[PDB]
Write a protein that binds this ligand. Structure first.
Ligand SMILES: CCC(=O)Nc1ccc2[nH]c(=O)n(C3CCN(Cc4ccc(-c5ncc(C(=O)NC)cc5-c5ccccc5)cc4)CC3)c2c1
Length: 383
């Protein structure tokens, strides 16, 4: 039943380097809209690429004959921006896309929270750190412009409340109080292989759930998006917002090659991210770094990952598999997805059900007495 509805060449604005690039796109009747560097030869679809419930806008800026697909995916507004040669072409694409979307169709208030800190500002909203007044618990509140618009896992930040104001949509997410992983790593310089295995196993369990139950690629796996809860278990965060980049969106050192290249991508992107995070945990340094962005892009796309003489053979095997440039050769990039990593000898002896059930005790216990303990927000202790 799944068929191609429309296909052809488009100019897509790049997601991280914001330049125009020719990509061959397939629109299919299951909602997927996916672009390739070349016309493909041709498996559960990924929501990332779905046009279901998206809004189509035609614009003449920055460039004439542009059209934008804007979607709310979980709690983040994403935009994909396209150009074609003629307005007649644009009309053909937008009506095809809109027809596909259509065919898919078939009290807490702000007064309850104390504002603490601005965490982030984006094009369509902001994210603030808040404390619920009645419990003293900490939350990240995503506050999105209404016009432009929770299955629990132990290691994902839970969406706790959602509500709207007259012109905003608010998403209230649990905020781990066990400290940022970048803070713990920099304090300790480097983690043992055992400690990295513990955190890596929890991330794998969370990514397996996202890929296989929710059919979504996280795409943002980086050390900055990892926190510890009060007991020392991992929380992958959902605090992001789309930004217009700085004159390039954000920072490149964590991005998978195929994402950097605005190529087709899939679940393998998250295994690259797992490799970047685990490489830094066990080596104490990012895998690729250079002040020059041109040099950094070429490092990520072309330079062979090097390892310290410190690293064991199991860890080198894991990291070199996770950091393969070609996602088709990358560990976890085959149809078994996460099971390829769960079965790797680096994780030998890990009982994966005990990972999910938190039966393995964290190697490091953050210095807090409860979920309301402010230690990792106290300026004095954060240095
Ligand atoms: C430089 C500044 C900028 O604008 N960057 C940019 C540009 C284009 C983008 N396109 C694009 O998808 N993302 C983002 C990439 C990272 N995802 C990040 C992302 C991806 C998926 C989820 C997510 N999904 C569904 C569920 C669920 O339970 N379903 C029932 C749960 C989660 C979840 C994941 C972890 C923790 C908690 C919740 C959450 C966050 C969000 C989208 C883009 C980012």
């Amino acid at each position: 039943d799944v068929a191609i509805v429309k296909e052809g060449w488009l100019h897509k604005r790049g997601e991280y380097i914001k330049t125009w690039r020719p990509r061959y796109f397939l629109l299919k009747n299951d909602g997927t809209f996916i672009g390739y560097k070349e016309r493909p030869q041709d498996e559960a679809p990924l929501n990332n690429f779905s046009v279901a419930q998206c809004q189509l806008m035609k614009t003449e800026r920055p460039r004439p004959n542009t059209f934008i697909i804007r979607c709310l995916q979980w709690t983040t507004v994403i935009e994909r921006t396209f150009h074609v040669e003629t307005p007649e072409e644009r009309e053909e694409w937008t009506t095809a896309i809109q027809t596909v979307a259509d065919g898919l169709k078939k009290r807490v208030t702000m007064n309850e929270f104390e504002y603490l800190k601005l965490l982030g500002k984006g094009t369509f909203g902001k994210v603030i750190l808040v404390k619920e007044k009645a419990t003293g618990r900490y939350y990240a509140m995503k506050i999105l412009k209404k016009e432009v618009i929770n299955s629990r896992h132990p290691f994902l930040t839970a969406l706790k409340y959602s509500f709207q104001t007259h012109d905003r949509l608010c998403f209230v997410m649990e905020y781990a109080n066990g400290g940022e992983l970048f803070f713990h790593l920099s304090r300790e310089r480097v983690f043992s292989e055992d400690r990295a295995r513990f955190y890596g196993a929890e991330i794998v369990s969370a990514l397996d759930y996202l890929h296989s139950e929710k059919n979504v690629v996280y795409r943002d796996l980086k050390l900055e998006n990892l926190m510890l809860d009060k007991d020392g278990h991992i929380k992958i965060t959902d605090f992001g917002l789309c930004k217009e980049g700085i004159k390039f969106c954000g920072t490149p050192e964590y991005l998978a090659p195929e994402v950097l290249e605005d190529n087709d991508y899939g679940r393998a992107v998250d295994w690259w991210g797992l490799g970047v995070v685990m490489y830094e945990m066990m080596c104490g340094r990012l895998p690729f770094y250079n002040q020059d962005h041109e040099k950094l892009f070429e490092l990520i796309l072309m330079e062979e990952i090097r390892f310290p003489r410190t690293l064991g053979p199991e860890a080198k095997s894991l990291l070199s598999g996770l950091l393969k440039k070609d996602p088709k050769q990358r560990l976890g990039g085959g149809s078994e997805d996460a099971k390829e990593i769960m079965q790797h000898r680096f994780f030998a002896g890990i009982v994966w059900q005990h990972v999910y059930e938190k039966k393995l005790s964290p190697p490091f216990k953050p210095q807090v007495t409860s979920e309301t303990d402010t230690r990792y927000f106290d300026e004095e202790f954060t240095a």
